Amino acid sequence: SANLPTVLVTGASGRTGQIVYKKLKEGSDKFVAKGLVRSAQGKEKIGGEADVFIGDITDADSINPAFQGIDALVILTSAVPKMKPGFDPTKGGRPEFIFEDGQYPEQVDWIGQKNQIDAAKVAGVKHIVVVGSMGGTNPDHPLNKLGNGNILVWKRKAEQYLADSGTPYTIIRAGGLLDKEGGVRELLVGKDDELLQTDTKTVPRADVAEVCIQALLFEEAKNKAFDLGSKPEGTSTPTKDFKALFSQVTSRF
């Protein structure tokens, strides 16, 4: 093993996941990419290459092939609520969202993520990175009511399980995600939702993807949990010193 590390990214066809997948592919001088997606549809979307595997994270055996021989894992899966089809705006209410049965946050973000962490551990991974959301410090956060799923709570339960496991881990709680241009913004790291009290609380999906990558290259990023926000494009200078950035973080959770 003077070989480059094999990095598996799950949720590889998701919006943020497809960028990490693409970045790991471009970074051929640093990584060997691998990805896991939920559908053949998703596999073709990111390029149908042979390093992409199809499987459901809540079906334990089903994901084992993907995890074989991996050295690092980047978890980018998430439960996703869909608008329940009954809404009628013109006599004011507010849409209710739903999660397909067996696809709720408890099953996908907590148990599901537990599935992935447990398989990575069996396979001997060395570093696990997971992407989540800011807001977890407040159990009464409105997002937990979406689809009556408590999505932040189950995600944080999997973050604690990851931090507790002993495997080198980085937990990145992202602020509001943006389909905005990555690498063109000064990025900010916070602790325990403090950034929510600022105007720099959202972040380009491409910068969340690049932070996941860099976490893989610095000892500093290991055994760290931090929030991620940024400043708009055009106002300041885009982040470059990543060792410094991660050396700002001291929290293990």
Ligand X SMILES: NC(=O)c1ccc[n+]([C@@H]2O[C@H](COP(=O)([O-])OP(=O)(O)OC[C@@H]3O[C@@H](n4cnc5c(N)ncnc54)[C@H](OP(=O)(O)O)[C@@H]3O)[C@@H](O)[C@H]2O)c1
Q: Which positions are annotated as active-site residues?
A: 133
User: Mapped to the 3 state alphabet, what secondary structure does 134-200 carry?
Assistant: CCCCCCCCHHHHHHHCCHHHHHHHHHHHHHHHCCCEEEEEECEEECCCCCCCCEEEECCCHHHHCCC
Distance in angstroms (rounded) separating the CA atoms of residues 37 and 53? 6
Of the candidate spans 35-43, 117-125, 136-144, 242-250, the one that interacts with ligand X by CB under 6 A turns out to be: 35-43
If binding is defined by CB under 6 A, does position 108 make contact with ligand X? yes
Binding mask 149-178 for ligand X (x = CB under 6 A): -------------------------x-xx-
Which tokens belong to 228? Answer: 């991620």
Q: How far is the CB of 128 from ligand X (least distance, A)?
A: 14
The residue within the footprint of ligand X, chosen from 6, 11, 120, 150 (CB under 6 A), is: 11
Tell me which DSSP letter residue 238 carries.
Answer: P
Of the candidate spans 9-17, 20-28, 136-144, 185-193, the one that interacts with ligand X by CB under 6 A turns out to be: 9-17
Q: How far is the CB of 246 from ligand X (least distance, A)?
A: 19
Distance in angstroms (rounded) separating the CA atoms of residues 135 and 49? 36
Query: By C-beta, is 23 or 205 nearer to ligand X?
Result: 205
Per-residue burial over 108-121, b = 16 or more CB atoms within 10 Å of its CB, e = otherwise: bbbbbbbbbbebbe
Which residues form the interface with ligand X (CB under 6 A)? 11, 13-17, 38-39, 42, 56-58, 76-78, 80, 108, 112, 131-133, 174, 176-177, 205
